[PDB]
Design an enzyme around this catalytic site. Structure first.
Site, PDB file in Angstrom:
ATOM      1  N   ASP A   1      15.567   4.331  -5.510  1.00 49.92           N
ATOM      2  CA  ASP A   1      15.091   3.229  -4.658  1.00 49.92           C
ATOM      3  C   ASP A   1      15.953   1.973  -4.529  1.00 49.92           C
ATOM      4  O   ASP A   1      15.422   0.858  -4.463  1.00 49.92           O
ATOM      5  CB  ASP A   1      13.687   2.791  -5.109  1.00 49.92           C
ATOM      6  CG  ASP A   1      12.598   3.806  -4.743  1.00 49.92           C
ATOM      7  OD1 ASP A   1      12.736   5.016  -5.060  1.00 49.92           O
ATOM      8  OD2 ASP A   1      11.586   3.370  -4.136  1.00 49.92           O
TER       9      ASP A   1
ATOM     10  N   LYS B   1       0.883  -1.155   0.000  1.00 53.30           N
ATOM     11  CA  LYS B   1       0.000   0.000   0.000  1.00 53.30           C
ATOM     12  C   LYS B   1       0.927   1.212   0.000  1.00 53.30           C
ATOM     13  O   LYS B   1       2.151   1.069   0.067  1.00 53.30           O
ATOM     14  CB  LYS B   1      -0.881   0.010   1.250  1.00 53.30           C
ATOM     15  CG  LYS B   1      -1.922   1.132   1.267  1.00 53.30           C
ATOM     16  CD  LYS B   1      -2.904   0.963   2.435  1.00 53.30           C
ATOM     17  CE  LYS B   1      -3.998   2.041   2.459  1.00 53.30           C
ATOM     18  NZ  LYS B   1      -4.846   1.912   3.684  1.00 53.30           N
TER      19      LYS B   1
ATOM     20  N   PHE C   1       1.130   6.945  -2.779  1.00 54.31           N
ATOM     21  CA  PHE C   1       0.999   6.937  -4.232  1.00 54.31           C
ATOM     22  C   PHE C   1      -0.173   6.030  -4.678  1.00 54.31           C
ATOM     23  O   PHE C   1      -0.883   6.320  -5.647  1.00 54.31           O
ATOM     24  CB  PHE C   1       2.304   6.408  -4.806  1.00 54.31           C
ATOM     25  CG  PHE C   1       2.755   5.122  -4.160  1.00 54.31           C
ATOM     26  CD1 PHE C   1       2.515   3.891  -4.780  1.00 54.31           C
ATOM     27  CD2 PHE C   1       3.394   5.138  -2.915  1.00 54.31           C
ATOM     28  CE1 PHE C   1       2.905   2.688  -4.174  1.00 54.31           C
ATOM     29  CE2 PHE C   1       3.788   3.943  -2.296  1.00 54.31           C
ATOM     30  CZ  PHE C   1       3.543   2.714  -2.929  1.00 54.31           C
ATOM     31  N   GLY C   2      -0.375   4.934  -3.957  1.00 58.20           N
ATOM     32  CA  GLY C   2      -1.434   4.013  -4.313  1.00 58.20           C
ATOM     33  C   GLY C   2      -1.170   2.656  -3.696  1.00 58.20           C
ATOM     34  O   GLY C   2      -0.923   2.550  -2.489  1.00 58.20           O
ATOM     35  N   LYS C   3      -1.199   1.611  -4.513  1.00 57.06           N
ATOM     36  CA  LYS C   3      -0.980   0.267  -4.002  1.00 57.06           C
ATOM     37  C   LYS C   3      -0.394  -0.655  -5.063  1.00 57.06           C
ATOM     38  O   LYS C   3      -0.365  -0.310  -6.250  1.00 57.06           O
ATOM     39  CB  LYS C   3      -2.316  -0.307  -3.505  1.00 57.06           C
ATOM     40  CG  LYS C   3      -3.382  -0.483  -4.587  1.00 57.06           C
ATOM     41  CD  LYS C   3      -4.744  -0.811  -3.977  1.00 57.06           C
ATOM     42  CE  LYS C   3      -5.531   0.463  -3.640  1.00 57.06           C
ATOM     43  NZ  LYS C   3      -6.610   0.236  -2.634  1.00 57.06           N
TER      44      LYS C   3
ATOM     45  N   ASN D   1      13.471  -3.576  -1.972  1.00 51.93           N
ATOM     46  CA  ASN D   1      13.175  -3.570  -3.368  1.00 51.93           C
ATOM     47  C   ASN D   1      13.930  -4.690  -4.120  1.00 51.93           C
ATOM     48  O   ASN D   1      13.970  -4.696  -5.336  1.00 51.93           O
ATOM     49  CB  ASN D   1      13.507  -2.198  -3.935  1.00 51.93           C
ATOM     50  CG  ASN D   1      12.501  -1.110  -3.480  1.00 51.93           C
ATOM     51  OD1 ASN D   1      12.367  -0.841  -2.320  1.00 51.93           O
ATOM     52  ND2 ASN D   1      11.814  -0.498  -4.413  1.00 51.93           N
TER      53      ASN D   1
ATOM     54  N   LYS E   1      17.367  -0.466  -2.424  1.00 51.51           N
ATOM     55  CA  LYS E   1      17.361  -0.817  -1.018  1.00 51.51           C
ATOM     56  C   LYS E   1      16.844  -2.228  -0.917  1.00 51.51           C
ATOM     57  O   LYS E   1      16.085  -2.653  -1.760  1.00 51.51           O
ATOM     58  CB  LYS E   1      16.546   0.206  -0.196  1.00 51.51           C
ATOM     59  CG  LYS E   1      15.156   0.546  -0.667  1.00 51.51           C
ATOM     60  CD  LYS E   1      14.626   1.651   0.269  1.00 51.51           C
ATOM     61  CE  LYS E   1      13.183   2.103  -0.009  1.00 51.51           C
ATOM     62  NZ  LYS E   1      12.131   1.070   0.330  1.00 51.51           N
TER      63      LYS E   1
END
Length: 271
Positions: free
Chosen positions: A121, A15, A18-20, A126, A123
């Site tokens: 991103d 979630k 920005f959204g999901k 991810n 990390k």
């Protein structure tokens, strides 16, 4: 064209503001993907850019459609589990394993930077592995943030932050914990900006050299923060045994093979 009705809902992958991101299955192929559902309301450097950035270690954008409300991105989903899960089941990775993973990452980053694209991103959350043991850099997380000093001090997401992210990721792979894993936590701001990162003694001095380099607080002095970008990193002591063509060719054998049958195997889709 693709549409919401083309997929079966499996579970929530993530979630966010920005959204999901949902784990879905395309009824036509039986294939699994992660669907990022972005509120149009909430919202570019994320769309199309990724839509086209294609690379062995970068999650691919399978379809891109939009509802009248949101933006939908169906992307390939690695089914060999998440790096975090594997790491923790070992506390640490062998320096050659770090190496194996870091190089596939360096390959992706060299590529994105060649297209003036900053990833922002890199990390552990991810990072996933595909069915074959190979790395897949995802665009979303299922942990304290370790932003790059120049991001904390100047909100400067230039190329270097990716190298900084590479360092924090391998530091955790080789040491088993983040750099300030014990020191409280609301301290992170001053620690990242002004505390010297210390390395275990059990680290080969080349590995120790890489980390000290990737974690330089001055982007202008970070391993990879120089005009030669990835090259400084590809040619680091720690990186000799490597065959970069091999790297991007997925010709290297992964030091660990996830226990899945086929990409169809849904066994890593739990905890």
């Amino acid at each position: 064209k693709v549409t919401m009705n083309d997929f079966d809902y499996l579970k929530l992958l993530g979630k966010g503001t920005f959204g999901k991101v949902i784990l879905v299955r395309e009824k036509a192929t039986g294939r699994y993907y992660a669907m990022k559902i972005l509120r149009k309301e909430v919202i570019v450097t994320e769309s199309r850019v990724l839509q086209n950035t294609r690379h062995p270690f970068l999650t691919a954008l399978k379809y891109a459609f939009q509802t009248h409300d949101r933006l939908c991105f169906v992307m390939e989903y690695a089914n060999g589990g998440e790096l975090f899960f594997h790491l923790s089941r070992e506390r640490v990775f062998t320096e050659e394993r770090a190496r194996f993973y870091g190089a596939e990452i360096v390959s992706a980053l060299e590529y994105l930077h060649s297209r003036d694209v900053v990833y922002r991103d890199i990390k552990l959350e991810n990072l996933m592995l595909d069915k074959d043991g190979h790395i897949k850099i995802t665009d979303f997380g299922l942990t304290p943030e370790y932003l790059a000093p120049e991001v904390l001090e100047d909100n400067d997401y230039g190329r270097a932050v990716d190298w900084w992210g590479l360092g924090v990721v391998m530091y955790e792979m080789m040491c088993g914990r983040l750099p300030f894993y014990n020191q409280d936590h609301e301290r992170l701001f001053e620690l990242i900006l002004m505390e010297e990162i210390r390395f275990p003694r059990t680290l080969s001095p080349e590995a120790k050299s890489l980390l000290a380099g990737l974690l330089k607080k001055d982007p202008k002095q970070r391993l990879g923060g120089g005009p030669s970008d990835a090259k400084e990193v590809m040619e680091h002591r720690f990186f000799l045994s490597i065959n970069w063509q091999d790297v991007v060719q997925k010709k290297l054998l992964p030091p660990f093979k996830p226990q899945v049958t086929s990409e169809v195997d849904t066994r890593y889709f739990d905890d």
